[PDB]
RNA sequence: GCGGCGG
DNA sequence: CCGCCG
């Protein structure tokens, strides 16, 4: 698997969940700071989402701060999941495109 | 042949502190006591 | 599984504390594996092993806490779960204070010594009432006590 | 005192006679530096 | 008040030098610099090469002689000789005693211009028929030099020894309270120096002082 | 690190591209002679024992220092494959 | 760390300069006595800040280098636009960083001289530096830290 | 003594690669500018000690 | 591949006690085991050496 | 070879100085001593005590003046004055201004043989009807003298200020290894200097070196 | 080939 | 995993 592309078009994105189900019977919680970071850091937003007053354009790669924002917001109660590009849904047969992999080089 | 201690050589004490020689310092500028007597080796505290 | 509001609260709090301990132990673990300076030392096996002893206690607290019944019966007559018993030894006039609770609630540190449901002395008391007199076996012999009373 | 600056080292430092040894690890066994040489006859490899 | 540089010298080994008063913190500013030179720059002498008659390599053994060639050449670097004129760059002491005796550094055949301040140094012990004859090359150098760095070859079968030129064993400086002046915040630098004998505490001090000055001048032409 | 590598990285759509450009330009620096540069007048690279880095130190060093300025052009299909090597030998002794 | 840390000593009495001026003077003489330490639990400022007030950032270090103050001592120092209550160590730290990377303003924008430097405070420093000033520039700060971190480490004792 | 001048001259801006015992991640090998030094051992930068 | 010599530690004509070291082994001096030497050591950090 | 003393000076504040090659651990023997000097010996100027007419304490506030006593006194430490001859051991600067004006260091009335190279130095901003009149004392000294150490008493109600004599701000030196054919264990001393402007990094250096030399001499006559 | 040993 | 000795 390698990275050769032009923003592959197929927009079928993965939704990064911000809340974890069961640890003590049923009760929704904010996944640990670390774990969320793991899932959203250096990612590319599939679709746009205004969360706490700011307009996080579609396709923007959310830096660490941005992910903090999303967490801070989740605290308030404005978003439970996240639209983001990923390899799990790349169209490029053999390989993966820029927008889907993400930031980290 | 004669094996004089040089930079790459590794020494160790009976307690388990093992290590290699990093720099061979000229008595000139190495840690000395009030009375002229200089020390011979400096073990980094952090490994304890 | 049967718990008292008191019992519940206690086990709930302990669980909280062990979560903090796990988060700490973890942080620690992570640092070690990240160090890669001094390997093969009781640095991993200890950190790890420590974290395990925790997680285990946690699984025990979550299990018990995930499916326990709460019996609100402060007004009853016969010794049942949640009952606080007091036994006097006919001979020495010794006053002993105890409370029978489910295995998970037992704890000699408590005000009334909390004894297990399926605990010998625990067995002996369940099903009896003020006045009764009973025995069990003890290394020195066997001492019978009389239930002087039973508060909530 | 430093030795390089002759200025003291703020704070007492422990020192003493420690028994330390040199190990069967001379760097004599430590520096094969290759430029060019022999190749295997059957399989093309720069064996030495 | 001009630094009263006093001196108390006993022998050619010890040599304390007092010098005060000195404005706040110069005692140290001088004390250390001089110390560093004293041990690293001062010139002297050491046994640079030796040769025993029936020995081919340094790791050999000579009949009727307790000590091994290495136990010996080891003891020779402990030999402190003393030349008197530059015309003495490379001296070759000669020694040879036989039978039941204890070879001491005093048994070297005298060389009119140079003296051995290291007399009772134990060189070797001889049982019977202990035929020991050897020539030890000595030089005037500076600092430390590994026998592998110079590789002296007077005779095809002689073994080079390690160079121990620094004629000082230990230097120490002390900064004490004030003696004269209108202020109490002052330095009283007194440094005590230790020499093997080759040169004198004072001799050293001065040379060091010079080397220092010598370098100071190097700040002349910019570029 | 290296002289404005960040500036360099900014000049390419992909990291690895920079390398390729950097390289091939270091090649043309030696092949067609070492006088095929564009910024030799002032601030041309330099060495320490004798200011001689003006003649032949490292190639890539040059390439980069040249690429740092808006002198050279790089493209997918800029000049006809073969016509480039022909014209280069012609204009460079 | 050892250079950014601050010291706290013993306090015979209530450190109230929160309000008294005879508290600036008295508390400041009781300090010249053997009563109140150069780092007493005084709310507004411990006598330590009262005595020494440094204008230029350099001003402080030199006083240190002359023996007046130790690096880990709470003093007052006039910076770009604020009279800040910090220690020489801390300040020194600022400079180091602000030196590694030329943009001095962007420097103190990414460091917190409010706590001793911990592996993390640094971790995050590096990370921030990378995103903020570029790759190579950060490299420079690392080397910088490496250097100082080590020197102080040796003289700290 | 002139050869050294040469060697140090040929190395100017070239770099070499270094490898650790078990190569585990991409950083198991990094590139560095060599600076000629005395002795046998190889001088390695502390900060990268964590990598390899 | 290590040196293995025996260095006599006794002098000519000496009254020896039964079971007394006549010569020292490869790494034993005075009859004691020795492997390396005792050096004066300061326990602190240097630049990074 | 002869230490190549290269120089890179920009302005009168910064000054880079390289000096190699040098023998084993010598850059450090030079560097440190020079630094020790460059900060404690170099003579210059610093404001000693100040006095604002209506002000009594160090911690207060003059109406019509944004700056606090503290800030002003602070600012004054920044003041860099330069005397011309010995006759000026202690000079009193006077300055009075009112109304809506910015009080710069160039507002002090000119004194005969004294010069103010820190003109645009912002001392205080005066609001409407801002009465600011003070007298700042300036002296020639060496090093740093805490306001609590000297304690000048021109006017019994005035305030003593820490003395910033040294016109040198900080000093940094590095001992990097340098190559020379045969051996590589060589010292290369590059020392960088920062000055307030009163004198240049190059002058300061020389002065230092001289001062050091001068002391080397005092090791002349025994007793 | 099998023993030993470094990280 | 990589490396080296006998
Ligand atoms: Zn894709």
Of the candidates J43, J200, J45, J15, the one whose C-alpha atom is nearest the C-alpha of residue J116 is J45
Q: CATH class for domain A13-85? A: alpha beta
Note the CA–C1' distance, B3 to L6, in angstroms. 21
Are β-strands E81-82 and E122-126 bridged in parallel, bridged antiparallel, or unpaired? unpaired
Chains D and B touch (3+ CB pairs under 8 A): yes
Q: Taking a C-beta distance cutoff of 8 angstroms, is the pair G68, J146 a contact?
A: yes
Q: Taking a C-beta distance cutoff of 8 angstroms, is the pair G128, G120 a contact?
A: no
Question: Mind listing the domains of chain J with CATH numbers?
Answer: 1-43+166-219 (3.30.1360.10), 44-165 (2.170.120.12)
Residue numbers in I near B40 (CB within 8 A):
39-41
Phi-psi region of C36 (alpha: psi -120 to 50; beta: other; left: phi over 0): left
Of the candidates E46, E13, E44, E58, the one whose C-alpha atom is nearest the C-alpha of residue E171 is E13
H/E stretch holding G83: strand G83-86
Closest residue by Cα to the C1' atom of nucleotide K7?
H21
Helix and strand totals (H; E) in chain G:
7, 3
Exposed e or buried b per residue across J66-94, where buried means at least 16 C-beta atoms within 10 angstroms of its C-beta: ebbbbbbbbbbbbbbbbbeeeebeebebe
CB count within 10 Å of CB D12 equals: 8
CB count within 10 Å of CB J148 equals: 13
H28, H44, H50: which to substitute to probe chain C, counting the most C Cβ within 10 Å?
A: H50
* N-to-C CA span, chain F: 35
CA dihedral over C4, C10, C12, C14, signed as positive or negative: negative
F73 and G CB contact within 8 Å: no
D32 touches strand L (CB under 7 A): yes
Rounded Cα distance between I37 and E152, Å, is 29
Chains touching I by CB (3 or more pairs below 8 Å) = B, D, E, G
Q: At what angle do helices G135-155 and G119-133 cross, to 10 degrees?
A: 150
Nearest nucleotide to B10 by CA–C1' distance? K6
Q: Report helix, strand or coil for I2.
A: coil
Topology of the domain comprising C74-147: Chitinase A; domain 3 (3.10.50)
Interface of H with C in 33-52 (CB under 8 A): 49-50
Q: Report helix, strand or coil for G106.
A: helix
Way it was determined? X-ray
Check CB contact under 8 Å for J181 and H5.
Answer: yes
C-alpha distances in angstroms, C109 versus C86, C123, C147?
17, 20, 22
Q: Taking a C-beta distance cutoff of 8 angstroms, is the pair J170, G61 a contact?
A: yes
Rounded Cα distance between A47 and A35, Å, is 22
Resolution (A): 4.1
Are β-strands G75-78 and G53-54 bridged in parallel, bridged antiparallel, or unpaired? parallel
Note the CA–C1' distance, I2 to K4, in angstroms. 17
Strand partners of residue J163: J145
Strand partners of residue F13: none
Closest residue by Cα to the C1' atom of nucleotide L4?
D29
* The domain over range C1-73 is classified in CATH as 1.25.40.10: no
Rounded Cα distance between C127 and F80, Å, is 102
DSSP tag of E83: -
Rounded Cα distance between J172 and E218, Å, is 20
Q: What angle do CA D29, E164, E125 make, to 5 degrees?
A: 90
What residues does each domain of chain G span? Answer: 1-157
The token pair at A11 is 């927009």
Q: Report helix, strand or coil for H25.
A: coil
**Chain A residue closest in CA terms to C23:** A32
Rounded Cα distance between G36 and A39, Å, is 54
Helical H segments across I1-49, by residue range: none
Closest residue by Cα to the C1' atom of nucleotide L1?
H22
- Rg of chain G over Cα atoms, rounded to whole angstroms, equals 17
Q: What angle do CA J43, J49, J52 make, to 5 degrees?
A: 145
DSSP tag of J105: G
Chains touching A by CB (3 or more pairs below 8 Å) = C, G
Q: Taking a C-beta distance cutoff of 8 angstroms, is the pair E34, E208 a contact?
A: yes
Q: At what angle do helices E201-217 and J201-217 cross, to 10 degrees?
A: 160
Rounded Cα distance between E113 and G86, Å, is 68
What's the CATH number for F1-93? 3.90.940.10
Strand partners of residue A88: none
Exposed e or buried b per residue across A33-70, where buried means at least 16 C-beta atoms within 10 angstroms of its C-beta: eeebbebbbbbbbbeebebeeeebeeeebbeeebbebb
Note the CA–C1' distance, G31 to L5, in angstroms. 70
H/E stretch holding E122: strand E122-126
* CATH assignment of G1-157, among 3.40.980.10, 1.10.274.100, 1.10.260.40, 2.60.40.420: 1.10.274.100
Rounded Cα distance between J199 and J39, Å, is 13
Note the CA–C1' distance, E20 to L6, in angstroms. 68
Rounded Cα distance between E189 and E178, Å, is 10
Of the candidates E122, E132, E12, E143, the one whose C-alpha atom is nearest the C-alpha of residue E76 is E122
Tokens 């006095």 map to which residue? J51
Rounded Cα distance between E109 and A81, Å, is 98
């Amino acid at each position: 698997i390698v990275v050769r592309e032009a923003d592959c078009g197929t927009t079928n994105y993965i939704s990064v969940p911000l809340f974890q189900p069961d640890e003590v019977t049923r009760s929704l919680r904010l996944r640990k700071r670390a774990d969320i970071e793991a899932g959203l850091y250096g990612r590319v937003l599939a679709r746009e989402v205004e969360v706490l007053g700011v307009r996080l354009e579609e396709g923007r790669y959310l830096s660490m701060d941005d992910v903090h924002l999303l967490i801070k917001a989740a605290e308030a109660g404005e978003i439970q999941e996240v639209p983001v590009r990923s390899p799990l849904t790349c169209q490029t047969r053999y390989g993966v495109c820029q927008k889907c992999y993400g930031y980290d080089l | 042949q004669k094996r004089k201690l040089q930079v790459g050589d590794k020494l160790a004490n009976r307690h388990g502190n093992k290590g290699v020689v990093a720099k061979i310092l000229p008595v000139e500028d190495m840690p000395h006591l009030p009375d002229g007597t200089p020390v011979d080796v400096i073990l980094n505290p952090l490994g304890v | 599984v049967k718990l008292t509001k008191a019992g519940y609260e206690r086990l709930m709090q302990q669980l909280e504390r062990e979560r903090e301990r796990l988060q700490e132990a973890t942080k620690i673990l992570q640092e070690l594996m990240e160090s890669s300076d001094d390997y093969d030392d009781s640095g991993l096996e200890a950190a790890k092993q420590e974290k395990a002893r925790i997680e285990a206690r946690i699984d025990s607290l979550e299990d018990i806490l995930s499916r326990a019944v709460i019996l609100e019966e402060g007004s009853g007559e016969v010794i049942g779960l949640g009952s606080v018993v007091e036994l006097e030894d006919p001979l020495s006039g010794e006053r002993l204070s105890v409370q029978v609770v489910s295995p998970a609630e037992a704890n000699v540190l408590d005000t009334p010594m909390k004894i297990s449901d399926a605990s010998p002395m625990g067995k002996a008391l369940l099903g009896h009432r003020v006045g009764d007199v009973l025995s069990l076996d003890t290394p020195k012999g066997r001492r019978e006590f009389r239930v002087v009373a039973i508060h909530g | 005192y430093d030795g390089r600056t002759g200025e003291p080292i703020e704070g007492p430092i422990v020192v003493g006679q420690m028994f330390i040894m040199k190990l069967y690890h001379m760097v004599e066994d430590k520096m094969h530096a290759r430029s060019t040489g022999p190749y295997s006859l059957i399989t093309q490899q720069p064996l030495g | 008040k001009a630094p009263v540089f006093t001196v108390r010298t006993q022998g050619r080994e010890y040599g304390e030098f007092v010098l005060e008063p000195l404005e706040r913190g110069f005692g140290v500013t001088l004390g250390n610099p001089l110390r560093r030179i004293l041990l690293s720059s001062i010139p002297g002498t050491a046994v640079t090469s030796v040769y025993i008659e029936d020995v081919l390599h340094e790791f050999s053994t000579i009949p009727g002689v307790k000590e091994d060639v290495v136990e010996i050449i080891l003891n020779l670097k402990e030999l402190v000789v003393r030349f008197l004129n530059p015309s003495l760059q490379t001296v070759t002491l000669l020694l040879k005693a036989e039978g039941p005796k204890e070879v001491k550094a005093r048994d070297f055949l005298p060389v009119a211009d140079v003296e051995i301040m290291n007399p009772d140094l134990h060189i070797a012990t001889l049982e019977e028929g202990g035929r020991l004859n050897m020539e030890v090359r000595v030089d005037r150098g500076v600092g430390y030099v590994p026998a592998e760095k110079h590789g002296i070859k007077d005779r095809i079968n002689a073994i080079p020894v390690d160079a121990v030129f620094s004629p000082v064993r230990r230097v120490a400086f002390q900064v004490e309270d004030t003696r004269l002046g209108q202020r109490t915040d002052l330095d009283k630098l007194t440094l005590r120096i230790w020499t093997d004998g080759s040169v004198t505490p004072l001799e050293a001090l001065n040379q060091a002082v010079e080397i220092l000055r010598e370098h100071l001048t190097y700040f002349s032409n910019p570029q | 690190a290296e002289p404005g590598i960040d500036k360099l990285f900014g000049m390419v759509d992909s990291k690895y591209r920079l390398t390729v450009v950097v390289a091939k330009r270091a090649q043309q620096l030696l092949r067609h002679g070492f006088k095929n540069t564009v910024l030799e007048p002032e601030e041309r690279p330099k060495m320490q024992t004798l200011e001689g880095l003006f003649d032949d130190p490292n190639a890539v060093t040059w390439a980069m220092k040249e690429l740092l300025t808006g002198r050279l052009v790089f493209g997918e299909n800029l000049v006809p494959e073969d016509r480039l090597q022909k014209e280069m030998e012609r204009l460079y002794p | 760390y050892y250079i950014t840390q601050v010291r706290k000593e013993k306090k015979g009495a209530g450190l109230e300069f929160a309000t008294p001026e005879e508290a600036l003077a008295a508390h400041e003489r009781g300090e010249v006595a053997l009563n109140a330490p150069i780092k007493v639990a005084g709310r507004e400022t411990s006598v330590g800040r009262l005595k020494y007030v440094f204008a230029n950032p350099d001003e402080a270090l030199l006083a240190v280098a002359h023996g007046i103050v130790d690096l880990q001592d709470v003093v007052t120092v006039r910076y770009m636009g604020k009279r800040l209550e910090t220690s020489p160590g801390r300040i020194l730290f600022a400079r180091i960083v602000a030196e590694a990377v030329e943009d001095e303003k962007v420097a103190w924008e990414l460091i917190q001289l409010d706590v001793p430097q911990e592996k993390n405070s640094l971790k995050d420093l590096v990370y921030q530096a990378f995103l903020r000033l570029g790759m190579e520039k950060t490299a420079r700060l690392l080397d910088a830290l490496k250097y100082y971190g080590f020197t102080f480490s040796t003289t700290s004792g | 003594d002139e050869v050294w001048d040469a060697l140090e001259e040929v190395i100017h801006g070239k770099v070499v690669l270094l490898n650790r015992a078990p190569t585990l991640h991409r950083l198991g090998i990094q590139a560095f500018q060599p600076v000629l030094v005395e002795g046998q051992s190889i001088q390695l930068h502390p900060l990268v000690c964590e990598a390899f | 591949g290590t040196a293995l010599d025996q260095r006599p530690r006794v002098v000519v004509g000496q009254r020896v006690r039964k079971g007394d070291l006549l010569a020292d082994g490869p790494a034993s001096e005075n009859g004691f085991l020795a492997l390396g030497q005792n050096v004066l050591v300061a326990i602190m950090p240097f630049d990074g050496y």
